[PDB]
Design a protein around this nucleic acid. Sequence first.
RNA 1: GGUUGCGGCCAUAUCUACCAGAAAGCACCGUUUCCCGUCCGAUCAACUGUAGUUAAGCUGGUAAGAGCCUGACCGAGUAGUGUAGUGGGUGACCAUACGCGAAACUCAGGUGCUGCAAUCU
RNA 2: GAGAACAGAAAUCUCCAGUAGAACAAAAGGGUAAAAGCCCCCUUGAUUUUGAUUUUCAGUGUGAAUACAAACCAUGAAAGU
RNA 3: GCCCUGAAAAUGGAUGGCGCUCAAGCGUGUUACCUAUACUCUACCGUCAGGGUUGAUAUGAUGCCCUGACGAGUAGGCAGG
RNA 4: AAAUAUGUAAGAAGUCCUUGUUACUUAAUUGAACGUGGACAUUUGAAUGAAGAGCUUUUAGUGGGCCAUUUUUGGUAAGCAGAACUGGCGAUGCGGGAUGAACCGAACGUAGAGUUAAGGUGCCGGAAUACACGCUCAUCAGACACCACAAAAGGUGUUAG
RNA 5: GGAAUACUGCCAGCUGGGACUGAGGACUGCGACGUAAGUCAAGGAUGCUGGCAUAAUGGUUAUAUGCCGCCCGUCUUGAAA
RNA 6: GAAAUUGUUGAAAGGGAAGGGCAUUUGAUCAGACA
Lengths: 58, 159, 48, 185, 172
Amino acid sequence: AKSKNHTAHNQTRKAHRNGIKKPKTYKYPSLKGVDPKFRRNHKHALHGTAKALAAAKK
Amino acid sequence: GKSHGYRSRTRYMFQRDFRKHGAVHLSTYLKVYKVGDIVDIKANGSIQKGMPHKFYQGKTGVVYNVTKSSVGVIINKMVGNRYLEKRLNLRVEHIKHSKCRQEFLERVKANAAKRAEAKAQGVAVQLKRQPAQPRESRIVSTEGNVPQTLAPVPYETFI
Amino acid sequence: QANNFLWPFKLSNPSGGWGVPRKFKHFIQGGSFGNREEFINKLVKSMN
Amino acid sequence: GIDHTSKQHKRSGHRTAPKSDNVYLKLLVKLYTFLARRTDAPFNKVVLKALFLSKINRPPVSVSRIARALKQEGAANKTVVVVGTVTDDARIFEFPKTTVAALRFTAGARAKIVKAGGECITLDQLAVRAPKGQNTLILRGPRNSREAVRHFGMGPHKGKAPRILSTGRKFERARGRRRSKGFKV
Amino acid sequence: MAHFKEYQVIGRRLPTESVPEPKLFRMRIFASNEVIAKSRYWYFLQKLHKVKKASGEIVSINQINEAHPTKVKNFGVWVRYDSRSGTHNMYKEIRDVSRVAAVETLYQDMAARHRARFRSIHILKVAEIEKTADVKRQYVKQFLTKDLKFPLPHRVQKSTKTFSYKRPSTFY
RNA sequence: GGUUGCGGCCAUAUCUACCAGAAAGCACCGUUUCCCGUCCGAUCAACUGUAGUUAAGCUGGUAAGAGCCUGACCGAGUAGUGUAGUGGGUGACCAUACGCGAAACUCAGGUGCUGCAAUCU
RNA sequence: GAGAACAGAAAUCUCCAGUAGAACAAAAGGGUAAAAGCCCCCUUGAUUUUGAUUUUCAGUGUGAAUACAAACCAUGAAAGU
RNA sequence: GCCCUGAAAAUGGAUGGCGCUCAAGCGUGUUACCUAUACUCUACCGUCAGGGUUGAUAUGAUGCCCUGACGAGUAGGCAGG
RNA sequence: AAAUAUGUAAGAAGUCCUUGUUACUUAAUUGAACGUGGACAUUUGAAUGAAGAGCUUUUAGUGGGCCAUUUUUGGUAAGCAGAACUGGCGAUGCGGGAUGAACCGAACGUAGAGUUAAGGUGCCGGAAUACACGCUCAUCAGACACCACAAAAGGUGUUAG
RNA sequence: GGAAUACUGCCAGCUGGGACUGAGGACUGCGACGUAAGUCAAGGAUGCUGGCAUAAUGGUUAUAUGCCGCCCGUCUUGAAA
RNA sequence: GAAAUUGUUGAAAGGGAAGGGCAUUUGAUCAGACA
Ligand SMILES: [Mg+2]
Ligand SMILES: [Mg+2]
Ligand SMILES: [Mg+2]
Ligand SMILES: [Mg+2]
Ligand SMILES: [Mg+2]
Ligand SMILES: [Mg+2]
Ligand SMILES: [Mg+2]
Ligand SMILES: [Mg+2]
Ligand SMILES: [Mg+2]
Ligand SMILES: [Mg+2]
Ligand SMILES: [Mg+2]
Ligand SMILES: [Mg+2]
Ligand SMILES: [Mg+2]
Ligand SMILES: [Mg+2]
Ligand SMILES: [Mg+2]
Ligand SMILES: [Mg+2]
Ligand SMILES: [Mg+2]
Ligand SMILES: [Mg+2]
Ligand SMILES: [Mg+2]
Ligand SMILES: [Mg+2]
Ligand SMILES: [Mg+2]
Ligand SMILES: [Mg+2]
Ligand SMILES: [Mg+2]
Ligand SMILES: [Mg+2]
Ligand SMILES: [Mg+2]
Ligand SMILES: [Mg+2]
Ligand SMILES: [Mg+2]
Ligand SMILES: [Mg+2]
Ligand SMILES: [Mg+2]
Ligand SMILES: [Mg+2]
Ligand SMILES: [Mg+2]
Ligand SMILES: [Mg+2]
Ligand SMILES: [Mg+2]
Ligand SMILES: [Mg+2]
Ligand SMILES: [Mg+2]
Ligand SMILES: [Mg+2]
Ligand SMILES: [Mg+2]
Ligand SMILES: [Mg+2]
Ligand SMILES: [Mg+2]
Ligand SMILES: [Mg+2]
Ligand SMILES: [Mg+2]
Ligand SMILES: [Mg+2]
Ligand SMILES: [Mg+2]
Ligand SMILES: [Mg+2]
Ligand SMILES: [Mg+2]
Ligand SMILES: [Mg+2]
Ligand SMILES: [Mg+2]
Ligand SMILES: [Mg+2]
Ligand SMILES: [Mg+2]
Ligand SMILES: [Mg+2]
Ligand SMILES: [Mg+2]
Ligand SMILES: [Mg+2]
Ligand SMILES: [Mg+2]
Ligand SMILES: [Mg+2]
Ligand SMILES: [Mg+2]
Ligand SMILES: [Mg+2]
Ligand SMILES: [Mg+2]
Ligand SMILES: [Mg+2]
Ligand SMILES: [Mg+2]
Ligand SMILES: [Mg+2]
Ligand SMILES: [Mg+2]
Ligand SMILES: [Mg+2]
Ligand SMILES: [Mg+2]
Ligand SMILES: [Mg+2]
């Protein structure tokens, strides 16, 4: 009892009913998977410059 | 039965370019990448460590990380009816800065120019690109150029 | 803007007819389709 | 025929009255559709729709969340408006004056406000006082605090909470949730 | 392919910095409208020169009218045509009153005698056979003999209503 | 302009055969006490710069040279190809319409450019 | 290729040419020349911690892999690896 | 090129049939003409959308009024009845 | 080394200036990242379109498929068997192809008037036994895509080369 | 030499014949014609005249005639089978 | 005291089924509006 093995027939018809939705994009993306050494420092860096700009409201 | 390993199907695509085998020239390494830079991806068969999978050959992503010997590149690959994000860890031998944007950069610095050269003169800005326009009228002359009359030509066999 | 403002015109079928026995070859081959240049007016006028 | 390019006869997808069947609500809506058709103030337009909202899109606002908004720079004399119930919050120890205009006020919420000599106002009373919503602060409550939205988007590496009934050790904490039992999520 | 007109068409390659004023070439083209004519022009040019329409321009299109349209003429005609198994050069002679009528019957004759459609033919030359005795195909010399006369036997007059009360006669 | 040290592009820098190279440099070149390496002080290590040389290296120039690089309506709008037709043909295949468009060929023209530092009739 | 007693088609010695025509466990394909091949020297990074990533994919698991972080080591004059 | 030979199967039979030969055949041209649930305009139904209108002293505010577009349907969903 | 397909880019999340933060990094207040302050508005940076765009939850049926043009594998081949892209049939009537799931035209609310498509107009049958130039006479002529087949090879039949 | 004509195109030039349609229901708009008063074909048909006033028109039904129309339900790529 | 199914009476149609769709003739039958 054999039957069909494979086809892509009709597949892009379906993909286009509701999209191929463009990737979508953000100001400020995630640092996910960025160098830990960098990130560590970047932290205290930010902490500092925040603290400063806070002192700017003395 | 079937075979679909990591570098399957990549016979001529990770191949080396006629008469361009051997050491990579050193400039490949003096290049410098920063986050946000747009790079093109193209595998160097001679450098087995840190190699883009074949799907990412010919593709252009954006740096998101900089490392001792590599750049992390984010590419949006589309699977199903949608895109997902992929981060790639690539050695500098498989990446180059993309000219895909030099035009733009060229065009902006130029556009800011003739905006000052205009504005601070008395306007007539006009700095959007326009498509190839159809041809205006013109008068073609004959002096030294009378039309030569051509006909079609008989069948023949040369052999 | 001038042109987008205009709704697509809705013509009838030509009145004289199409002038040809089969429409779906190029004008240059005795059909109706493609750039038929200034003969566009004769047609549209028979459809408007 | 027409090569359509968008689905035909599509409903807009937004409520248009409330689903609710309360006369009073249906009267408040009678009021604000008038004000929104005839005043061009944006405020009235926002409120008309919030009235249609269902119970979930109307999380409660707490008197302490209220107290905080007045804490905004320039805002202490505004009248907070809430198209929903307002609830009590024994966690704040010092509640301001002001004027809150809502749909419902719980017993204690109403007391807390009044005890500090403030006012609780129904929307129609708010309308007569401020037909363009002059000097009004609209507050909405936290929608995605609902317990339900915990379980939305459950999948591998999503971190989302099983739909689970009993819930202790030995309820879904084994193979698939830790490196030492098959794998983790 | 239709009722023909004959056109002078003139074209040239588009001008450039280094080569402004390119050479200019002309074809007499037999088509039914100027749109077919111009197209035909580019068809043969690319059979001859490095050009496409994309990189060249039409400079002028003009209809040429027959010089003496009520003078009978003996045409010599040269053609290239494609058969089902080969391609072929050929010479017919046509007797009419304009090149334009001549080309109409040629195309007919080719379709009728050789099943050649328009796509498959290339007119090479059409020229007036100035002095008889250079007329060569007999089905034409036939009509040059002096004081020529002939009957048209067996007259069929066309009836204008289904029944007739006589019985016809083919006298003439 | 020469040359050297470090280079970038990596044959217009390569290859084959000849000839020419001032001045400096580089080079070849002398030595075996010492560090050091060898079956062999050839390589590799050290010492001298003294005793010797343009012979080689190197640099350049010649050649209807080999290769390589560049150009061109040279070939060719050719091969191939996206789109069209109730186009032709029993078929195999093939014309036509609106577009895109090679490779070989052939001819001409070239034969390293250039960055940093020191040095030189 | 041309050379050397026994020594021959094939033993071991020398010189010239040599883009790889060899070799790199294994199928084949990529890759490689002061190396990725051949000889030698020193070694255990085939180690410790726990994440991210790529292929296969549901963007689950497994296999295999990549680039980092935190250790402890190896080798090298060193850059490094 | 057309035609002819090459050309053999089983109930009687199919250019759709009759029949057609300067065709009612083959190639090609030129006009006219016939007719789809398609196209143009109009009325009416329904669906979707955008406006307008609580002002009583009369009757539907889920109403009333203006306007524009659209309508195939198995499995299947939902809605008004 | 094509053609067709294919990645990215065409700005306010932009460009430029002045100079803070750090444990990273530099020989180095060097860099790197994140910033504070300042300068330039819609010809603000191609086209065409946009009955708007974005987002969330939940659930049905389905998980035998078949066909056409083109690409294409196995097989002598198949109304055979298996892939690629699109378009269809399945789920779909309507006009044409006599007939027919898939071809051609065209996609459906109830109707009037008009015009057409594909396909036709001797008669069946609405519509020229219309015009025009050739060709063909068959003692098994021929007659319209898909399509309901014919070949090598021959003819001093006839036509034009 | 100087005209005519064909062909293609234009006119917010004039004018005849024939078909379908007449949605809307005070007024409100954009205009046209006039010295003006007025008038009008300008945001959807009115005027004038006749016939019948009942099975006459219309509905229903039976039959006849033109064209059209296979047996539903099911499973199936595919059923009138 | 339904239907299948039957008898009689009346009316109608029928050249290898019947039944159905658009349309109209003919026969039978009938509502409404008019004043
Ligand atoms: Mg099975
Ligand atoms: Mg099967
Ligand atoms: Mg299956
Ligand atoms: Mg395989
Ligand atoms: Mg490895
Ligand atoms: Mg007309
Ligand atoms: Mg007509
Ligand atoms: Mg007419
Ligand atoms: Mg036809
Ligand atoms: Mg019209
Ligand atoms: Mg909680
Ligand atoms: Mg002439
Ligand atoms: Mg010297
Ligand atoms: Mg010694
Ligand atoms: Mg020595
Ligand atoms: Mg030494
Ligand atoms: Mg010398
Ligand atoms: Mg040297
Ligand atoms: Mg040479
Ligand atoms: Mg060809
Ligand atoms: Mg092609
Ligand atoms: Mg087609
Ligand atoms: Mg074909
Ligand atoms: Mg191998
Ligand atoms: Mg080395
Ligand atoms: Mg191991
Ligand atoms: Mg993984
Ligand atoms: Mg699993
Ligand atoms: Mg995984
Ligand atoms: Mg594996
Ligand atoms: Mg036959
Ligand atoms: Mg017939
Ligand atoms: Mg004919
Ligand atoms: Mg209709
Ligand atoms: Mg309509
Ligand atoms: Mg429907
Ligand atoms: Mg693209
Ligand atoms: Mg638009
Ligand atoms: Mg919109
Ligand atoms: Mg579902
Ligand atoms: Mg499901
Ligand atoms: Mg399922
Ligand atoms: Mg198809
Ligand atoms: Mg089915
Ligand atoms: Mg259909
Ligand atoms: Mg039919
Ligand atoms: Mg048929
Ligand atoms: Mg018949
Ligand atoms: Mg008829
Ligand atoms: Mg006629
Ligand atoms: Mg055919
Ligand atoms: Mg033959
Ligand atoms: Mg013959
Ligand atoms: Mg009316
Ligand atoms: Mg009315
Ligand atoms: Mg009555
Ligand atoms: Mg009467
Ligand atoms: Mg009866
Ligand atoms: Mg009946
Ligand atoms: Mg029938
Ligand atoms: Mg069944
Ligand atoms: Mg079956
Ligand atoms: Mg009883
Ligand atoms: Mg009837």
